[PDB]
Design an enzyme around this catalytic site. Structure first.
Site, PDB file in Angstrom:
ATOM      1  N   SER A  90       1.047  -1.474   0.042  1.00  0.00           N
ATOM      2  CA  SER A  90      -0.422  -0.320   0.233  1.00  0.00           C
ATOM      3  C   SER A  90       1.351   1.095  -0.215  1.00  0.00           C
ATOM      4  O   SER A  90       1.874   1.224   0.359  1.00  0.00           O
ATOM      5  CB  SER A  90      -1.283  -0.064   1.180  1.00  0.00           C
ATOM      6  OG  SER A  90      -1.023  -0.876   2.013  1.00  0.00           O
ATOM      7  N   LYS A 133      10.758 -11.266  -0.161  1.00  0.00           N
ATOM      8  CA  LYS A 133      11.406  -9.917  -1.422  1.00  0.00           C
ATOM      9  C   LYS A 133      12.986 -10.175  -0.952  1.00  0.00           C
ATOM     10  O   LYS A 133      13.763 -10.249  -2.258  1.00  0.00           O
ATOM     11  CB  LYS A 133      10.636  -8.956  -0.342  1.00  0.00           C
ATOM     12  CG  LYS A 133       9.272  -9.092  -0.276  1.00  0.00           C
ATOM     13  CD  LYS A 133       8.918  -7.795  -0.118  1.00  0.00           C
ATOM     14  CE  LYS A 133       7.875  -7.846   0.573  1.00  0.00           C
ATOM     15  NZ  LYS A 133       6.779  -6.190   0.701  1.00  0.00           N
TER      16      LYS A 133
END
Lengths: 196, 195, 196, 195, 196, 196
Positions: A90, A133
């Protein structure tokens, strides 16, 4: 290959992300800006809604710190490649970074990937799947990964890994930019604008 | 952690909320305000109409008592983290609290969560899911949920939740600030403006 | 509790609605109005369309009989409570009734719930679920229930429940108002104003 | 058969895309222009966000070099065929190209598929699904395929397939144009304008 | 109960529809017009889109045949009652009847119920579940049922059931209005602008 | 049934769709036009942008050929039918043809169907689903099916469909047209207009 791993480029950032729950990925963004013909944010494909949300949200931060209002300019955002099956961050700091880059014509280090979301206050706050990640990043041959400071102890690197990426915890937007924008008289001015 | 739980801190607060069922979560707001070149509330999500509302109710209370116009200054309302199937609360007090906190730039106790619905004229109206909401403030290790008054008896907490937390019965917005807005000169000032 | 069940308050009206497929619930409602300085109906959540249909219809009637032109006002409407799988009567009259009350600033009796679909022209049209609604009404301990006069053959109560509530029905909004509005100067001067 | 494999046509280009999660398809397009006596971009379908996006990156690029403006034109685009399960690429070049072909009046080469994302500056960006974009274009008898240079390493072909198509890697929209636009006085003066 | 089975009322028509696909139901409606003081169709809850559509079609012939432009009015349609599991006719002649009725204030006769769809040239087209519908009409004590001429042989009634209701097949809107609008000077002048 | 199949009425064109998978639907179109009392394309549903496309394109090719301009008309475009999963061709020619019909006030061979995408040069682009369409056109017992020319070879048919029908290939609007207008004086005037 879907992204650059070194060099410097205007409006260009390698964010990171998640595919499924299995895994993380290099998510590269270009931002470009042109003045409006009142102003909108163009993007398409499986991520357009992440993109108007970051871009729009961050937009006051982006006015405190050029002085360009967003509604006086059109913001052209794409994700480079296609990705169905991906959750992105976000308010993502890459998408804001790439936009500030593009507005300012100051290039971005491709060898430094990033993750985090960006308080409208300008802080960077935590995001999911950090280990996954860094991991995609370690797999991509990228060199440094910026991350939020409160995912600091979510970095469960399984050694041999501890020395193949430099993990940089930030907590302001100004730290993300400091660490990725190309050095020069422009970024120097820019940095000095970060205060109250 | 992700959501903060110790401290005091500006235009950001602890919303309680519910993903539908018996189903509590802690939903923070983060607010920020910029005096404009009128102005526009800017917020995204399933809960924009609510960000908008909270904000719209809360300018009566402020042009009237404070006498600040909040029409002069763009306002960012943003909720945090990934929230899906969430019912929001109409004119939700977390937002309006954060809104008073951006604008009079004064921190909030992050021990404290809350839930409630803000009437234009200042009331804290009751809301659904008051219990599962308290259960959320608990497994999130917080100090005090604030809660509407007309909701007392919708607490019906069990043995594994009983005495774990301070519940604050509130009827008025300013009961909300009295209790979360940190201390000193500015709060004190903001308080008297009211009565 | 999400509703009040005695006394008078301004702009507040205990609606009736149906949850899932049996049962009633009281649908309590607040309306408030500030000048706009045209204006809007601000309401949120699932039952918003009903709020705007009812205010859209109350207001024309306001303009015809009183003077007050809702054109010039922001009406702010809320369903105290949060109502999923609940389904209203269109042009709900609890809602129209709470608006007529914020504007005149004459408080409403909380001991009486109601239900009706309001025509632009001023009638109280019939609505589904009376029996069940009246049961919920019995259940929260509300003294009377105002219903659309054509719903009178729908009332299916076990003789002992006919002891419990008053059932009043009605064919025009101004009858909802003698029936609800606080006894008074204001109220009188108001009933005068709907001489037809 | 839903596209052409030989000859030049004004404003028709063979895009390339994917259906489900493999298989390429050829994705052919017309653009057309009429003036607007403002200008709008007219496309329906599952792929029209893309069509609007393509065109809106072309405009500025065209304006900057050619002087013609497109505010004063309506643009009409069609995905010849019906395209479900299919994702196009961001701002496909094939559409960008079919717009330039329209406005300038220069035929496009129908035996060369093309894939790519056009950036507003005129650069050719890399894309998902190159190989099956390649397999499918062989499948259709196209003789060349234009791919974003940055995807050269994604080209994964069996030799029996290495000989069946021409893989041409480009990095800029003017190269695409030289490589597809018909030969002649129009083509050349057009190119003199991107230098 | 929810419809009037006799007398004439402005803008008030008894359409017919089907509950699920077991049965027909009377689906009564009201259109009402006020001026726009750009113009709109307001309408609520469940068949709100059937409502917006029917009106958006007939607008056509609301102008072409007679009087007013409906982009200068607001059209406020309601279904009297609440409507889940019910399936709405398209381009509904019961709406168009209701809307032509409210604009001319010429009352519609409530002992005649109707089904069918209005093309934009104003033929009435076949609809579904006609027998079920008429069975609803019959069941509900409405005297007469208007139905599309191409459904004529789709009417499959028991002996006893056929004299229980006048069945009226029509092929064009103006026949539906010939049939249900209050005789009198105003209809006469309306009916005589339904030429060529 | 709800559709036409022998005959010669104006404004109406049996087209072809697929209900999703591959299941032939005849999708009848009714066009209608009146003057603006600028003008508008008045459609309802999922196909409503196709319509305005089919329209758009057709005004272009009409203005050019006939000289007539129809930025002045209010155009009504209706879909006769009741199915979801509805899947339309761009600039769908059915609509293009119902419209040209509308305008030139010229009756259509109801006994003919068609699929097709119309370009601004009023070419007939091919469309997907050629075989399912030829089928519902068989099931609908129709005599002729116009298809785009380049679709010529996505035509199959097991024994059960072969020589069940005059399938007729086209590359231009004026073919589409020569095929379906009612003969005589106004076909004729307007025809040669496409040549002059």
């Amino acid at each position: 290959k879907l992204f650059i791993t070194e060099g410097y480029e205007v409006g260009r950032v390698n964010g990171l992300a998640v595919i499924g729950e299995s895994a993380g990925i290099v998510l590269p963004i270009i931002a470009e800006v042109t003045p409006s013909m009142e102003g909108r944010v163009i993007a398409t494909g499986r991520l357009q809604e992440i993109a108007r949300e970051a871009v729009m949200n961050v937009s006051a931060i982006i006015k405190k710190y050029t002085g360009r209002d967003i509604s006086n300019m059109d913001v052209h955002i794409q994700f480079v490649g296609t990705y169905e099956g991906v959750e992105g961050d976000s308010a993502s700091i890459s998408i804001a970074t790439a936009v500030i880059s593009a507005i300012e014509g100051i290039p971005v280090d491709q060898s430094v990937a990033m993750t985090g979301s960006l308080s409208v206050k300008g802080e960077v706050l935590p995001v999911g799947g950090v280990t996954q990640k860094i991991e995609a990043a370690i797999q991509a041959g990228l060199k440094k990964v910026i991350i939020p400071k409160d995912n600091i102890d979510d970095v469960l690197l399984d050694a041999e890994h501890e020395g193949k990426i430099e993990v940089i915890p930030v907590s302001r937007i100004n730290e993300v930019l400091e660490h990725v924008l190309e050095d020069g008289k422009k970024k120097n001015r820019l940095m000095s604008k970060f205060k109250e």
